[PDB]
Design an enzyme around this catalytic site. Structure first.
Site, PDB file in Angstrom:
ATOM      1  CB  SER A 155      18.371  -5.528  -1.827  1.00 36.84           C
ATOM      2  OG  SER A 155      19.172  -6.056  -0.764  1.00 36.84           O
ATOM      3  CB  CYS A 173      10.175  -7.008   0.216  1.00 44.83           C
ATOM      4  SG  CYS A 173      11.820  -7.668   0.023  1.00 44.83           S
TER       5      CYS A 173
END
Ligand SMILES: N[C@@H](CCC(=O)N[C@@H](CS)C(=O)NCC(=O)O)C(=O)O
Ligand SMILES: N[C@@H](CCC(=O)N[C@@H](CS)C(=O)NCC(=O)O)C(=O)O
Lengths: 237, 236
Positions: B81, B27
């Site tokens: 994130s 990812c």
């Protein structure tokens, strides 16, 4: 409420001492974030509105992308992007802070702000669509985004988004909810009880409503702006 | 470590002196957090999630079911994130990744904005018709990368935030790292300074930690586009 500066205008003097300059535009929801943050923080500021349809060429020295809001401090620093200018203000003027101080609590607000991230482009695409073409597609997409906001607030069961008192996150997403009536999008919020309440509550804060424009004036401004009218940015002065 | 999937045991409570990160080995969003956890010497346990066979208990960790997700010894759950990275630089001021002057911090966040379209573009390129993907997408990446190329040309520094590696560099790195595997290497042809920054980032110890070769990444995608429960653990 000062006339915007346009092509062939004198670039502004040096920023007044004790003052931060903000390049703005009276109808811009992004700039309203900065202005509401400047106001809610008692920061002394001079507003320089820009004619976004007749941009003064020296404004590209202030921002290569030619978009408001833009900060200019007494030291000549130029900060761009509405969310960033607000974050810069809550950190360079650590007086009345709009973000919480616990990083976990701050991040919990930034996470809520992410739920809003699609809304401005959606509203912008709705404004820029064929007028006599009533697009359910855009309106449906806004319902989904507003449902995430409705749901998000129900979970916190607080009056505002960042908690019980007015937080940065509330000024960040407010300008778009305030424009829903004028934009005739009030049906994207029919299924959002908690959101209607929050909107009403925001109408009572002195800062979130300082620059209230009646639905009538705003629609005519949009009409002029979609036609790239040099008079759009100053309409109503 | 093998990903956790449907029918797995939810992990024990986070060890004290340790922060948990829910991740997935390929990812790019989680790669941000992991590199930030690494470059700051933060002690952390990684829990990979099988994004094609998600354990039902992961949705209490994140209702949206995405990685990365932070969990600290206290049970605080941080999502997104960029938010986990900013949280880490603020709860752990050992090795500051953002500058301290707000104007310079802002100058980096402003630079980050030039990147904001790139992850969705790359996702659209990956999920397009295998044969005859789309030069239209590639053109949007070229235009988007032009803003980054020029920005670095303007600053005339080695990295994006200045001369040492800054948060901004780790934030945007994972996507440029995958351009080889994704065969987008022609979106960076007219970006000399970008190529240089890329080469330099491959030599940073953190940006290269657990290196995934283009072939392995290509095979992971192929399994992932077919919703394979084995995509997330492929190569272990
Ligand atoms: N992402 C920017 C958007 C700012 C923006 O789009 N401002 C508009 C006015 S609402 C503008 O300056 N328009 C001029 C143009 O697009 O040429 C932010 O958050 O500051
Ligand atoms: N905006 C999120 C994006 C995270 C994201 O999309 N992660 C992907 C893996 S790269 C994911 O969890 N995929 C699972 C799914 O989409 O169901 C962030 O930055 O954390």
């Amino acid at each position: 409420s000062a006339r915007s500066l346009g092509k062939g205008s004198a670039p502004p003097g040096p920023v007044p001492e004790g003052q931060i300059r903000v390049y703005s535009m009276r109808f811009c929801p992004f700039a309203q974030r900065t202005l509401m943050v400047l106001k809610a923080k008692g920061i002394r500021h001079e507003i320089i509105n820009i004619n976004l349809k007749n941009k003064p060429e020296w404004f590209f020295e202030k921002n290569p992308f030619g978009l408001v809001p833009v900060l200019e401090n007494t030291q000549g620093h130029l900060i761009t992007e509405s969310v960033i200018t607000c974050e810069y203000l809550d950190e360079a003027y650590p007086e009345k802070k709009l973000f919480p101080d616990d990083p976990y609590e701050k991040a919990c607000q930034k996470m809520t702000f992410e739920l809003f991230s699609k809304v401005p482009s959606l509203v912008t695409s709705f404004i820029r669509a064929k007028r006599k073409e009533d697009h359910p597609g855009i309106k449906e997409e806004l319902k989904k985004e507003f449902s995430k906001l409705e749901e998000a607030m129900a979970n916190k069961r607080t009056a505002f988004f960042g908690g019980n008192s007015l937080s940065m996150i509330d000024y960040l997403i407010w300008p778009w909810f305030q424009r829903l009536e004028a934009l005739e999008l009030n049906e994207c919020i029919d299924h959002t009880p908690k959101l209607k309440l929050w909107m009403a509550t925001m109408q009572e804060d002195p800062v979130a409503s300082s620059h209230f424009i009646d639905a009538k004036t705003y629609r005519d401004y949009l009409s002029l702006y979609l036609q790239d009218s040099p008079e759009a940015c100053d309409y109503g002065l």
